[PDB]
Amino acid sequence: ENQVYSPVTGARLVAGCICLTPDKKQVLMITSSAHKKRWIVPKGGVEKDEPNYETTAQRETWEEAGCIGKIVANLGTVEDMRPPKDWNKDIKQFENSRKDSEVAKHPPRTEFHFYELEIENLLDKFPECHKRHRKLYSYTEAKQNLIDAKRPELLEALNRSAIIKDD
Ligand SMILES: [Mg+2]
């Protein structure tokens, strides 16, 4: 009941960080709690008392990755467009238009507000440090992790960052 939702779409409002090394060659990823073998980036629900998305983003980056640094860019918004859980056994599923196919119209699950952070410190002890792993990855490696994790929206956030893509 601390959770904030879009007054328009009902999507849950979430903020997180693309945390880059000063040389911009690697990004910090954490293992998912829902899927322990899948590598994602730190993010979490904005809480009712938080005054801005930067606050949520830096709180989640500390709670989930033991990462501290400074926000150096606003990477804007991306949306979790994954269908509902009930969808799989539904009657109508897809919409087709002559030269393309799309999944049937639905509201986003989540609206993500992402910021790029320059890592200033990684600490060995942090709130979720026994419940998650956290590791730096080059662009090529991070990109493959996020496809494997089935999170293209997190890949879109990574691609807006200043991470060096010429590995
Ligand atoms: Mg989270």
Task: Look at residue 47 and tell me if it is in a domain.
Answer: yes
What is the experimental resolution, given in Å to one decimal place? 1.8
Q: Which residues pair with 28 in a beta bridge?
A: 136
Task: Look at residue 133 and tell me if it is in a domain.
Answer: yes
| Count of domains forming the chain | 1
In whole angstroms, what is the distance from residue 64 CA to residue 127 CA? 7
In whole angstroms, what is the distance from residue 9 CA to residue 109 CA? 9
C-alpha 43 – ligand 1 centre gap (Å): 5
**Contact present, 19 and 67 (Cβ < 8 Å):** yes
C-alpha 135 – ligand 1 centre gap (Å): 16
Q: Which residues participate in the annotated binding site?
A: 12, 32-33, 43, 60, 64, 80, 82, 109, 132, 151, 153
Q: What are phi and psi of 28, to 5 degrees?
A: -80, 125
13-36 burial code (b ≥16 CB/10 A, e <16) = bbbbbbbbeeebebbbbbbeeeee
Task: Look at residue 6 and tell me if it is in a domain.
Answer: no
Task: Look at residue 132 and tell me if it is in a domain.
Answer: yes
Task: Look at residue 165 and tell me if it is in a domain.
Answer: no
Experiment used for this model? X-ray
Here the CATH number for the domain that contains residue 117 is 3.90.79.10
Q: Which residues participate in the annotated binding site for 1D-myo-inositol hexakisphosphate?
A: 12, 32-33, 43, 82, 109, 132, 151
C-alpha 160 – ligand 1 centre gap (Å): 20
Task: Look at residue 19 and tell me if it is in a domain.
Answer: yes
User: Domain residues for 71?
Assistant: 12-160
